[model samples]
Target chain A: TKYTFFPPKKSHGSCAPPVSRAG
Target chain B: MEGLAGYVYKAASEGKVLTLAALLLNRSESDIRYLLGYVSQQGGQRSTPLIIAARNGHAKVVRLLLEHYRVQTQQTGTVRFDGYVIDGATALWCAAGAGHFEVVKLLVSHGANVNHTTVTNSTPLRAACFDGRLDIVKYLVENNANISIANKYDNTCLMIAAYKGHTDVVRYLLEQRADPNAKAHCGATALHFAAEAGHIDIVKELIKWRAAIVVNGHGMTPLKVAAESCKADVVELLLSHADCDRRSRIEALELLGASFANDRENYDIIKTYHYLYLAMLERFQDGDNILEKEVLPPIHAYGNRTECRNPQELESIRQDRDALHMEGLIVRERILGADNIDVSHPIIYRGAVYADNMEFEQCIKLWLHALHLRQKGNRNTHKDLLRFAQVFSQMIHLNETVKAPDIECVLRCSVLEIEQSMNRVKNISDADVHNAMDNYECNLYTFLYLVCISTKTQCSEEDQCKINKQIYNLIHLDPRTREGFTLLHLAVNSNTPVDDFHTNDVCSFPNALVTKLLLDCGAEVNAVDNEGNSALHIIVQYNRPISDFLTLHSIIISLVEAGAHTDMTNKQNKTPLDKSTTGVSEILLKTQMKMSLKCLAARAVRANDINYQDQIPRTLEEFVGFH
Candidate 1:
């Protein structure tokens, strides 16, 4: 069902989501 | 000791203050110390009694625990509260993040370090500010928490609070004299986040504190970011400020329309129309009425869309959704400049929109244009290149209706990405070569998939020549991975550099077809990587499922026919024959029947450890080393 390519996952060591987080 | 540990942990977590007190009081010093320092195996093995109590916001339980002589208040544990598993957090850190002011106060009063940071360097005050826990924030700060302390990313409490639109927290931090101009590692201040998020109040507050209107690492000012993110209100707010000049305001207004067209989540054609219309009205205020427009010959190229020179024409097209979409596309690239990375996304977004409707041709052209922008801008194109690779491979494999030019366009752009990767080597020297190595490897993987499509697609004479020319260029470039493996090495290895995001159906690796194509294209069959593993060596060593045995056998046979050496040894002194199963070993041994005299001579030279550095010819020296 995907119409676009998802960007490859980078290193997962950091738990913080990019540009969207408070906790 | 085990029993005491379990009871204390359970009591603290359940907030059974009296039970926990009795357990601690009844135990000896050694047992009490063990109980206090115990980590529960149920979680990430990072939770202590003090941390668990603080996380649960059990102030009474925490007080009882802290009253113990052997209490380790500063001991760090993993707090998996909510959805976050924050490690290296002390009792005060968890209490502060959990918005427990009483627990925070008790811990700090009992000597919890207010500035104690987590593994990621986030402090108690930073966490408190994130949730707008004003009471906890004030208490932490009054008790000597550093309001200015940033996390590992250099994102300060002010930046998080500002980004979260926590006006009170931001206001308090500003009143406490937190640096409004403090930049994170990305050079983004509190204003950048506020503007990007469309938090107008936060933006106004930050601007009032004299936050500079500065360009970030991506060369984006807060105003530009507001426009690029389609935050029209934020764009208006930023443009009206005295800090923004007339030139920037006009540019942002123009960019605002483009971002509206590009917005995947909330795309509105009417919003796109208004912003472009506003940009035109603002631009023509000085009586300069010459409309700047370009006609792209390629129909799907974004700038091929026209703009309205006057209000009536703009209003006429207001009903025309297509016209408005086109205007947004054309105006965005015109204002942002072709090389601007900001200009590319709208094109890509538009292309994706086209693809959703089964309009592949338009999608191809738009994506091609975006790819060109990235190549010219010297931005990392691995993601884009792989997308094209994945898309084209799917189209060709599924027997979808794709024109010859569509495949050719991707082929050309894919090659350009590789050439870009090669050119980057000249600009960089000894600074994070590993990242560059990884990027090049990813580029190689993308091109290999593109080559897979080229071999499958029906092509005209010129297309064939173009395809051959690019493949020839690729072969000559001799792209290498971080460990010095060639594209051929990656081809037979089943793994790709972009494996994390791979679609299993397309360009799925250990690809027999691509392997055969590379062999036909004169890829060095016996080439060795830095570890001295050849294509044959790698193919043999790859342990595949029985389902893939036929594909693996064909790849092995292809390598053998292309003159791969089975007996070549890696640094670990393991040959392909040595590592292979009997069935695989038979293919390498029986396909060619015997080794060549030249190979045997090299083996003889290496077998004796002869001093043959200058004695052999330069070409032979390389072949001999493979032995």
Candidate 2:
């Protein structure tokens, strides 16, 4: 399967895919 | 904080997972978890026990810690031991770069995101590729690690691998569907690094996949760097592909000639190309060995020299250039009705010698002619013609006003410099300068006008002011409307030098105000309306174009106000200039006294106490004041 990472992750400081704002 | 701090830290890193887990109650896991998540500054370092274990790939110790404190995926900080740097890694990224495939899997399964990038924007997969860890690279990609994320420099996993010459890692990255044609920060693709490194197989692999052979950031072709680096293996391949390469190879030759002169190595890059071009010439004869018979003797004579070592060796090393020089005469005689342009016989050798001699325009002339013969009416014609115009345009004769060469450049200059150059222009000539003043007569007429805008009745000091004139035939001619409705006066105001000396090193003042005064003094009718009937001041006050830096909109409006512009004039929408104003400049124009325009309803709304003034509208009468 082709691995595509589109919708490029937004740049956050340090660890990425920043903790989702659920609260 | 834990009683077993020293033992646990050592045990975790040493992979004694059972003993490290036993330090706290595995049954009462939260306290054991507290020890794992407990971050402390020990001897000037921020570290956790889990961070240490993960960095060294203690997989079982990692699993026990992850079970209790699994969600503690916030980025870990620096740790140093005797000056070896271990800094700025997340728990997963820690395991990933160290090639701990199992530890990487454990972290990702425990809610640690697969693609968490560090401060450097280097993702786990990128670290794996760059760190030369093929196993974890496979692990991450199998688990769907996004190899697409770049570090801060846009160095993707494949790009980092290729640049670092991790051949296996580059191959895997390519197989995983990494973009073969991705550009790093400066525009070199994977093939550039591979070709420069002489990674012969990888170059063939990337080229097979249609990797871009396009010019790099320095405006060079793939073969240029390959040749400059003395990659004879790769150069042979590039020459074979040059026959089939999709794009123009002209710029490549120009860069190669200039760069190879400084290669420092003893490789006769110049002599080798002479042979390559001659070999190509021989191929053109269908193996008849025609060039081999005529060109080889002169080539041997040139390359046989002991080569000037101090550095004409750059020229002397490639000293066998005469081989191509000899064959060029025969091809030119046969190719395009003697002296008429023909590109069929590509100008492979001498085209670059043009740049070496600083005859860049001359080099460009040859390539365009090269294409002209080959493509038979190629569209590259107009684009190349424009380049010639720009080269001659750079001839900024600080003294001459009417050089035919710079007539184009002068017109191409911004309105600011046009006026500035005109005022500063003097009659002088150089070898590069045009023949006489008549060469730019039509253009000089326009220069005189820009000079007129800088001149004034008050500042009249020129002896030749009487002879300096406007266009006698076309003052009322088609006033080059950007919009058909905009009158000549509209063009005049919009064309004013919004800022002074915009394109040069030293600065010039904002001269739009003085130019308006000059235009008004020189029979430019002030009340002329645009297609929408908005006067020049209407566009001026609201001309919020970011291009105008100085003379803040307020000051320009105030200046135009002083110059007696019709601020009261209403357009077809029945809105005066005041109604058209919407930015910060609107606040001040409200106080500006255009006494004749105040009777309009929008103008009344500017000061109506019942209406909210801070509202975004230029006037709020219809919403708040209308009954």
- Candidate 1's residue-wise lDDT over B1-627, tens digit each? 587578767777675655454554544764655666677745564777777777777887766765545476787666675766666777777788778888888887778788888877887887777677677678777876677776778888887788777988888888888887787886776677787668989888887888878887667777887787778777777777877767677678877877787666558887788877887787677666544434333345754545555667777878877567777877676666676656777777677667667666777787888888877877787878777777676566567766777667777777777787787765778765667777887778778877766766778889777777777777877888877789899888855543433334566678888898788877888777898788877777676646687787778779878887766788876666776765754564566546589878888888898998998898899778777
Give i-RMS (Å) per prediction.
7.3, 20.7
Which residue pairs clash within candidate 2? B270-B318, B343-B370, B485-B531
Output the worst ten-in-a-row residue range by lDDT, candidate 2 chain B: B499-508
lDDT of 1 at B445: 79
Q: Please, what are the lDDT tens digits per residue for candidate 2 over residues B1-627? A: 555665666566676656554555644644645555666555554667666677666776766665555537556675452334445566776676667777777777676767776655667777666566677677678886777776666767776576566878877877767787787775666666676667777777677667757765544456755654546577668767855342223223322332232222422445445543433433344545222222122222112322211222233324444433423323222322222222222242343345346554444444344433423422112222222222222212132122232222222232222232223323444421232222222123233333333232122334223212222122333232323322234333443322122112111123344334334434334434444443344454445546664544533464455454344443333434445454554545555645553355444554464446566464533333321
DockQ of 2: 0.02
**How high is each candidate's TM-score?**
0.77, 0.40
